[PDB]
Amino acid sequence: KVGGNYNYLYRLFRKSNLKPFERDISTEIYQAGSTPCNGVEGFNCYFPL
Amino acid sequence: QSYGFQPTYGVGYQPYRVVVLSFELLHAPATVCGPKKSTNLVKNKCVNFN
Amino acid sequence: EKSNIIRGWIFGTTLDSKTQSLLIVNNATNVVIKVCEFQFCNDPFLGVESEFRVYSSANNCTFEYVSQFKNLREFVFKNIDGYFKIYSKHTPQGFSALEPLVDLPIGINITRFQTLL
Amino acid sequence: TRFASVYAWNRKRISNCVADYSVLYNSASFSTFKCYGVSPTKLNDLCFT
Numbered sequence: 001k002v003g004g005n006y007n008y009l010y011r012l013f014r015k016s017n018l019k020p021f022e023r024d025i026s027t028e029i030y031q032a033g034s035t036p037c038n039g040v041e042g043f044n045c046y047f048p049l
Numbered sequence: 050q051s052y053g054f055q056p057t058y059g060v061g062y063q064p065y066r067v068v069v070l071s072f073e074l075l076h077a078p079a080t081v082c083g084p085k086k087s088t089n090l091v092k093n094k095c096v097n098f099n
Numbered sequence: 100e101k102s103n104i105i106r107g108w109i110f111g112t113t114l115d116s117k118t119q120s121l122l123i124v125n126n127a128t129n130v131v132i133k134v135c136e137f138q139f140c141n142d143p144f145l146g147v148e149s150e151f152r153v154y155s156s157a158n159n160c161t162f163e164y165v166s167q168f169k170n171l172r173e174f175v176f177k178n179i180d181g182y183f184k185i186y187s188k189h190t191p192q193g194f195s196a197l198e199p200l201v202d203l204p205i206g207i208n209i210t211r212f213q214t215l216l
Numbered sequence: 217t218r219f220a221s222v223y224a225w226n227r228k229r230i231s232n233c234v235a236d237y238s239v240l241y242n243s244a245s246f247s248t249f250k251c252y253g254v255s256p257t258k259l260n261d262l263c264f265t
């Protein structure tokens with residue numbers, strides 16, 4: 001009604017299954033920096049936030 | 050009504066080709082798949098095979 | 100029959116341009132197997148070289164397959180688990196075993212068949 | 217390059233063959249490439265009718 005603003009946020013990060021009771025606090029832009037992201041570095045670099 | 054397309058038109062009005070592929074769920078024998086794996090063969094040592 | 104008077108078959112469910120059908124019709128070079136909506140009016144005539152009158156119209160094609168005392172040309176047809184299976188041998192007393200030829204994954208129902216002859 | 221209009225969109229039926237998705241998601245010629253329901257990579261490990 002006048003509440004959530006860039007604070008209550010989820011994660012769509014994948015390719016790394018976390019073990020039970022783990023803190024995934026990696027506040028980083030997700031990029032591979034190799035071939036499996038559009039074939040170059042810097043592309044497909046979306047922060048899962 | 051016909052589109053008006055010219056090379057000098059805006060990018061929003063520029064033509065774009067869109068292909069939508071839809072696969073039906075599993076209700077019949079499967080006929081479309083993909084390559085799985087291939088590996089050289091070894092002998093005289095007990096290994097796991099598929 | 101030591102000739103080619105009998106050549107192929109017509110096969111499928113109630114042929115009224117509905118559900119589906121099967122040809123399994125072959126012409127030496129090609130064993131063409133189509134399951135299209137072949138409108139069969141009243142004519143299982145052999146196509147001899149003049150023409151081929153087996154079908155009037157073909158609406159919706161779905162499958163296509165291509166491959167290669169007297170003699171007893173013997174066949175066995177089954178449909179089970181959604182697979183159509185054909186077994187055959189060429190050479191009535193005596194014992195002989197039959198070997199698989201093809202495995203069609205069609206899965207359609209069939210309740211009727213006819214011989215071209 | 218010859219494609220039909222949106223009102224007269226054509227349908228191509230593909231079945232009874234092996235599908236190679238590796239080219240699809242590894243080509244830079246596509247500006248937009250998004251899959252709904254199934255991850256694009258895992259599509260190379262499933263089969264459909």
Ligand SMILES: *[C@@H]1O[C@H](CO)[C@@H](O[C@@H]2O[C@H](CO)[C@@H](O)[C@H](O)[C@H]2NC(C)=O)[C@H](O)[C@H]1NC(C)=O
Nearest residue numbers: 124125126127128129130131148151163164165
């Ligand atoms: C036997 O029937 C087929 C199908 O009507 C004829 O066409 C052959 O098969 C496909 C078409 O379905 C194509 O590869 C060619 O049109 C033909 N291929 C070959 C290898 O012939 C075929 O011509 C007919 N053969 C005879 C002897 O009548």
Ligand SMILES: *[C@@H]1O[C@H](CO)[C@@H](O)[C@H](O)[C@H]1NC(C)=O
Nearest residue numbers: 116117118136157158159160
């Ligand atoms: C052929 O398939 C299309 C697919 O939508 C369908 O609309 C049409 O009725 C079918 N025709 C016949 C004769 O089954």
Ligand SMILES: *[C@@H]1O[C@H](CO)[C@@H](O)[C@H](O)[C@H]1NC(C)=O
Nearest residue numbers: 077118181205206207208209
């Ligand atoms: C065969 O018939 C049953 C009902 O009699 C039907 O549910 C089924 O869909 C038919 N098979 C095919 C392949 O359509």
